[PDB]
């Protein structure tokens, strides 16, 4: 049975025999205790030339974790050269799906740092966790909306409201999927209609545009049109272009 002493895990076994060392399997989960200090290893730890990672509690975990040379792939026990659980392996020019997150590894078996072009497409891997970015991020005062590392196109909700992430060469040679300046004009995209104010944000709720009434979904900013709609207790009929009757 292990007990934490001054923020350091020591495995004392049972009989009050004071200490042990080496690899240990405590309830399915595998630890390594420093040979000289008998402390549960924590973080990036080198053992006999082979690399390992342990969380703050000394529990070995598999995944893509940051080492002194960059994020390495500590892998199952039979992936590359009879490796062992949680050992870093050689992983060259290949994608890695892990917990429904994407990673890509370069020539020297390290995960990507931020922007990286892979065979024609432009991926952005989160510099913090090395995984392909998901959601709304801002790089160099440029806004994007990522899905699995690739900037998407469309009207998506952002930190300062709904932004129109346009394709490349739509506004000041913008990058593909980068948010642009879209002021005081409607937008038809994938059958849904939008309208953007002076701040380039798709309006929501009830908005009167040009002597006509519109209602835009709070969640997607899409204009309500095509038939009947029950916007909270009352029935309304919107036209095809979003004009209520």
């Amino acid at each position: 049975g292990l007990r934490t002493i001054d923020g350091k895990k020591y495995y004392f076994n049972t009989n009050t025999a004071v200490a042990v060392t080496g690899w240990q399997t405590i309830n399915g989960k595998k630890y390594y205790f420093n040979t000289n200090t008998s402390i549960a290893s924590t973080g990036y730890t080198i053992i006999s030339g082979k690399h390992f990672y342990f969380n703050t509690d000394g529990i070995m975990q598999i995944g893509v974790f940051k080492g002194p040379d960059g994020f390495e792939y500590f892998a199952p026990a039979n992936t590359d050269a009879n490796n062992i659980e949680g050992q870093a392996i050689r992983y060259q020019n290949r994608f890695l799906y892990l917990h429904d997150n994407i990673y890509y590894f370069g020539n020297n078996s390290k995960a990507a740092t931020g922007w990286v072009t892979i065979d024609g497409n432009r991926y952005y891997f989160e510099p913090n966790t090395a995984m392909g970015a998901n959601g709304y991020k801002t790089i160099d005062n440029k806004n994007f909306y990522f899905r699995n590392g690739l900037p998407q196109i469309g009207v998506f909700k952002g930190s300062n409201g709904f932004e129109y992430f346009a394709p490349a060469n739509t506004d000041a040679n913008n990058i593909e999927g980068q948010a642009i300046r879209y002021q005081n004009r409607f937008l038809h995209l994938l059958g849904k209609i939008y309208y953007f104010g002076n701040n380039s944000k798709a309006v929501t709720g009830w908005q009167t545009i040009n002597g006509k009434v519109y209602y835009f979904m709070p969640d997607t900013a899409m204009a309500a049109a095509g038939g009947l709609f029950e916007i909270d207790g009352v029935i309304y009929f919107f036209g095809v272009d979003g004009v209520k009757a």
Epitope: P76, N78, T79, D80, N82, Y91, L96
Partner: antibody, heavy 117, light 105 residues
Framework: VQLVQSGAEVKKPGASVKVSCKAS????????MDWVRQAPGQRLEWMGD????????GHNPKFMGRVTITRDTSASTAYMELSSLRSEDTAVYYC???????????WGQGTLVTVSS | EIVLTQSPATLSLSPGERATLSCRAS?????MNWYQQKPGQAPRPLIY???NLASGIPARFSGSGSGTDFTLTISSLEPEDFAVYYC???????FGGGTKLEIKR
């Protein structure tokens, strides 16, 4: 210990394909499954692999947009799904097993996918 | 990065004679796996790591190399050994272009 794959499926450009791989004679969770195709007389091309235990998949950047590998432990079957087939996808797709991460110990007999209008 | 290259595209020898296959890499790699394929058959694993061979592989076939250059060699050819021989690096799972070993007559 043998692997047995599907039969020759034949599709038209833009469609998809399902190839299976029936692992036999061993513990399906122990090893990994690699998918490798071979265009007519061309060099062997590696597509992706899967780890049955943890649901870990890795692609080859060439097929990032279309290939997907899946897993059915109980059935001891490995799958790959090429989508949006180009006329240049006509190839023999193989299913191979990794021995402690060194080489391919067992190979399927290969599955022929023909793409053509 | 890593590109594997089969040094003799075709090699024409006779049975009973010693044969050499080379597979030179664009960079320094630790291990190299050698395979084999007959026409109409799936590739059969020949060598793995660099030296170590697989089951069902006679003691004819040897394997050795370091860094950039690796050599597959057959001590004494027998009529069955004539086929294509691919190399492979595992970490990138790239393959060579094959060397076709044909019967010289």
């Amino acid at each position: 210990v043998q692997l047995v794959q599907s039969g020759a499926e034949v599709k038209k450009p833009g469609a998809s394909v399902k190839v299976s791989c029936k692992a036999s004679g061993y513990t399906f969770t122990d090893y990994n499954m690699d998918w490798v195709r071979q265009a007519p007389g061309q060099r062997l091309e590696w597509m992706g692999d899967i780890n049955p235990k943890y649901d870990i998949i890795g692609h080859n950047p060439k097929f990032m947009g279309r290939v997907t590998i899946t897993r059915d432990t109980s059935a001891s079957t490995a799958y790959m799904e090429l989508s949006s087939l180009r006329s240049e996808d006509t190839a023999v797709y193989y299913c191979a097993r990794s021995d402690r991460g060194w080489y391919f110990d067992v190979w399927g007999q290969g599955t022929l996918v023909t793409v053509s209008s | 990065e890593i590109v594997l290259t089969q040094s003799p595209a075709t090699l024409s020898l006779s049975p009973g004679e010693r044969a050499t296959l080379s597979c030179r890499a664009s960079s320094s790699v630790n291990y190299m796996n050698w395979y084999q394929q007959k026409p109409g058959q799936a590739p059969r694993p020949l060598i793995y790591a660099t030296s170590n061979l697989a089951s069902g592989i006679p003691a004819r076939f040897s394997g050795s190399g370091s860094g950039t250059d690796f050599t597959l060699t057959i001590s004494s050819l027998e009529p069955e050994d004539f086929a294509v021989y691919y190399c492979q690096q595992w970490s990138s799972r790239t393959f060579g272009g094959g060397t076709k070993l044909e019967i010289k007559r």
